[PDB]
DNA sequence: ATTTTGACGCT
DNA sequence: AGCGTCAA
């Protein structure tokens with residue numbers, strides 16, 4: 208009762224851009240706007256591989272990882288934008304720069320955690336407290352929440368349903384209580400409406416958001432009403448929401464760990480986890496995972512929003528599948544140089560922008576026939592931002608993988624260079 | 633022969 | 644450190 212934590216101490220939002228790379232391309236090229244569209248990498252093999260899909264194209268069944276040639280079978284009028292190629296490889300600079308546009312806007316509202324190229328968490332707890340003081344007990348008009356869904360409501364047209372749910376929620380709020388978690392989430396949603404309006408006004412890009420008490424629930428909430436909408440998941444909404452929620456839908460449970468939860472416990476839904484003691488869950492999944500699951504299935508998580516707006520690593524990667532695998536020393540050295548030149552360009556820009564220098568170079572390769580994605584991943588010192596030195600050092604680190612008694616055997620099917628371990632500069 | 637990323641955990 | 648998991 209009075210000593211049972213409820214995980215309602217923070218207001219956390221997760222903002223995630225809608226079909227992000229597509230919107231970047233649609234801003235640049237108005238002919239792509241409001242069309243079935245996808246972003247592809249490469250072209251010669253099966254029309255290229257799709258990495259982002261507009262909602263209009265998703266209605267035809269087009270998905271990420273599809274070859275463009277097959278997507279065209281589902282959607283004959285599908286429009287395509289190609290990722291830039293530089294030095295023989297896909298180059299993601301346009302999307303990294305568009306991401307910075309969005310992150311810098313979000314950072315005006317609160318400190319952010321950059322969780323991917325297109326999404327960030329924000330801890331709105333302080334901002335909500337401030338806004339609740341500026342409010343002075345006044346009620347919250349539905350007009351301040353024009354794109355907000357309240358998960359679980361209404362209870363007892365889709366825009367009409369959205370407004371019915373919001374009306375039920377607001378009618379039940381105790382606006383007189385500055386410590387009420389539900390009121391805090393509501394003010395958080397007002398702030399997120401403002402943040403999302405600023406992103407769209409200042410970049411042209413639309414996004415969705417989740418508002419809840421922790422990162423996992425905010426991320427889950429965000430996807431409930433994509434695109435171009437935001438969703439509030441209250442603590443009270445958790446039992447019903449989790450009662451039919453597949454375990455794999457919760458962040459970190461979409462892979463082998465989640466599959467093992469399902470198999471070992473004989474359950475399907477997140478809510479079913481409440482029927483195990485913390486010790487039982489720790490016995491199956493480890494101390495850390497077990498405690499995390501015990502709290503998470505009750506809607507409780509403590510993972511903080513970390514104050515980090517910039518990536519911690521800067522990497523360059525290229526696969527050489529099938530016949531294109533690298534079988535000569537000239538080939539390996541040429542491609543290591545291509546990757547190192549892109550890396551040097553990005554590192555020099557990062558140093559000028561962000562007052563830091565990377566100090567370690569990680570080199571990773573895959574050899575043809577290896578079942579693992581990396582046959583070798585080894586580090587060396589990164590002492591100067593020079594592409595020829597970095598590529599020579601990478602070659603020195605990998606050269607003893609060549610079992611050729613000029614030739615490279617087995618052929619290399621992947622090269623990867625990554626700068627890590629930044630220090631102030 | 634989806635690829636190109638990038639954070640964090642384990643030992 | 645090097646390897647693995649998870650997800651964008």
Ligand SMILES: Nc1ncnc2c1ncn2[C@H]1C[C@H](O)[C@@H](COP(=O)(O)NP(=O)(O)OP(=O)(O)O)O1
Nearest residue numbers: 223224225226227228229258259260324325433651
């Ligand atoms: N497997 C992959 N390989 C390469 N790039 C990928 C990728 N998955 C995503 N990206 C890139 C391209 C994506 O645009 C971007 C963000 O990924 P999301 O937020 O997971 N998906 P999006 O924003 O497109 O649609 P939604 O409205 O459902 O959020 O990351």
Ligand SMILES: [Mg+2]
Nearest residue numbers: 223224225325
């Ligand atoms: Mg997105």
Ligand SMILES: [Mg+2]
Nearest residue numbers: 223323325326
């Ligand atoms: Mg995303």
